[PDB]
């Protein structure tokens, strides 16, 4: 489409927190019952440094706060704490311009869209909604993320649905291995008011896409609530490393606990 221009571009300073013991996911799709299984994969090490930012979804007031482009490294654990679905997706690539292929995973209200193309992304990717007073409902009607998209190599549009426009914690793990972009996900209703919650929750495999591109950077996409005229969403990023993990499967197959072997001598003994 046509990118919306902002004369005043700023971004909030990054902040730091700790991964606690999150990011665990199922490496394989094998049913395992009441047993300890050991595997060496790209895991988020326990008590890992995490960088977290905010997604400002309302202006109240002519300053555009932009999301930063973050490294991808070997894979990312991306988490979001919000009440309404502010975080809508991400863009992945190396140059993030028309010179190279780029992946775009976005979730508009209708369905999820995943496209790998030679995108010419906007300076400020924009997703805008306005409140339909006569229908007492929000309707998203602005989608200006990329100015050009040519020589596409991937497209996938999920079946339509209606997204609802007590916080929610949505966790994802993104892993780009052997031409497959593997995504694992988990959703829990969290009661915390600020910061990443401490706890354990195994991420289930969401989907692996044979995109076959190189990814070194990515950026987060959020929604903007257009108002006539404070509780912004918060997202957290950690990086995976090749680690050997000892996962504990219960009688039903749920990963109840894990041990990071290389965390400390105690875990090595475990």
């Amino acid at each position: 489409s046509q990118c919306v221009n902002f004369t005043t571009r700023t971004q909030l300073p990054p902040a730091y927190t700790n991964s606690f013991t999150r990011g665990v996911y199922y490496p394989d799709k094998v049913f395992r019952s009441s047993v300890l299984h050991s595997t060496q994969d790209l895991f988020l090490p326990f008590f890992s440094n995490v960088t977290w930012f905010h997604a400002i979804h309302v202006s109240g007031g002519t300053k555009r706060f932009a999301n930063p482009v973050l490294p991808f490294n070997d894979g990312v654990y991306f988490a979001s704490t919000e009440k309404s679905n502010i975080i809508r997706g991400w863009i992945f690539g190396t140059t993030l311009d028309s010179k190279t292929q780029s992946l775009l995973i976005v979730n508009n209200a209708t369905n999820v869209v995943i496209k790998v193309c030679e995108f010419q992304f906007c300076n400020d990717p924009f997703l805008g909604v306005y409140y339909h007073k006569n229908n007492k409902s929000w309707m998203e009607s602005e989608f200006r993320v990329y100015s050009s998209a040519n020589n596409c190599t991937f497209e996938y549009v999920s079946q339509p649905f209606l997204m609802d426009l007590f916080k929610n914690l949505r966790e994802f793990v993104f892993k780009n291995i052997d031409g497959y972009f593997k995504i694992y996900s988990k959703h829990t209703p969290i009661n915390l008011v600020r910061g990443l919650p401490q706890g354990f929750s195994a991420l289930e495999p969401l989907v692996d896409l044979p995109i076959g591109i190189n990814i070194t950077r990515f950026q987060t996409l959020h929604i903007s609530y257009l108002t006539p005229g404070a509780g912004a969403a918060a997202y957290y990023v950690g990086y995976l490393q090749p680690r050997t993990f000892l996962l504990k499967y219960n009688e039903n197959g749920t990963i109840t606990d894990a041990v990071d072997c290389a965390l400390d001598p105690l875990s090595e003994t475990k």
Partner: antibody
């Protein structure tokens, strides 16, 4: 004292150019997005172009794209429309109108063209 | 481009009401504005945000937008209401402000 004053219209042959003007007074000009809407004689309303409050964004109509240029001077409270390669189908009365910008956004969901100018007549004839 | 449909003419007796139909594609998702233009002068915004009246427009005018049925309503029609009425939206799918074809309201 909220008023919009168009000027610059005239009679012109096809191919020639013309620069329209719209002087605004009585309100905060830099808080509104400015439009051009033309009306051919005996015909309906046709939207021409829009420019946002600070001139950072502008959208044109397909019929005038590549020939018309919109601009604004915020320390003079004036809206402009440059019209090149004029054709007979550009004959109309040209109106300027304001619409409130929310908070850096002038899309037009919450506000419409609440104040219109008197208009200026443009005729393109051989 | 994005099409906005209106009936070309509507006739009503004084004191009765007139209904003007704005036809649009997925217009239930758009915010419709209405303009009154009496012959000889510039149009005037009479309904914005589907149903809001500006400060000076009398309460006889009202708009709706429910179930893909956007409608301008003028009750207690007077002879002074004889004008052309246009609906107007912002279509982000084409970066165009679109005006309807128009409706001439003559008072029988």
């Amino acid at each position: 004292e909220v008023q919009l004053v168009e000027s610059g219209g005239g009679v012109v042959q096809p191919g020639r150019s013309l620069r329209l003007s719209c002087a605004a007074s009585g309100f905060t000009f830099s808080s509104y997005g400015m439009h051009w809407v033309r009306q051919a004689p005996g015909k309906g309303l046709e939207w021409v172009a829009v420019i946002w409050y600070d001139g950072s964004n502008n959208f044109y109509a397909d019929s005038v794209k590549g020939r018309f240029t919109i601009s604004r001077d915020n320390f003079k409270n004036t809206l402009y429309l440059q019209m090149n390669s004029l054709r007979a189908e550009d004959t109309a009365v040209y109106y300027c109108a304001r619409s409130y910008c929310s908070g850096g956004f002038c899309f037009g969901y919450y506000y419409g063209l609440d104040v219109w100018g008197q208009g200026t007549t443009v005729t393109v004839s051989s | 481009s994005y099409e906005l449909t209106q009936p070309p003419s509507v006739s009503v007796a004084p004191g009765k009401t007139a209904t003007i139909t704005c036809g649009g594609n997925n217009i239930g998702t758009k915010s419709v504005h209405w303009y009154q233009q009496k012959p000889g002068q510039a149009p005037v915004l009479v309904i914005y945000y589907n149903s809001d009246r500006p400060s000076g427009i009398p309460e006889r005018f009202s708009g709706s937008n429910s179930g893909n049925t956007v409608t301008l309503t003028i009750s207690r029609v007077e002879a002074g209401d004889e004008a052309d009425y246009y609906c107007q939206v912002w279509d982000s799918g084409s970066d165009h402000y679109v005006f309807g074809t128009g409706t001439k309201v003559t008072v029988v």
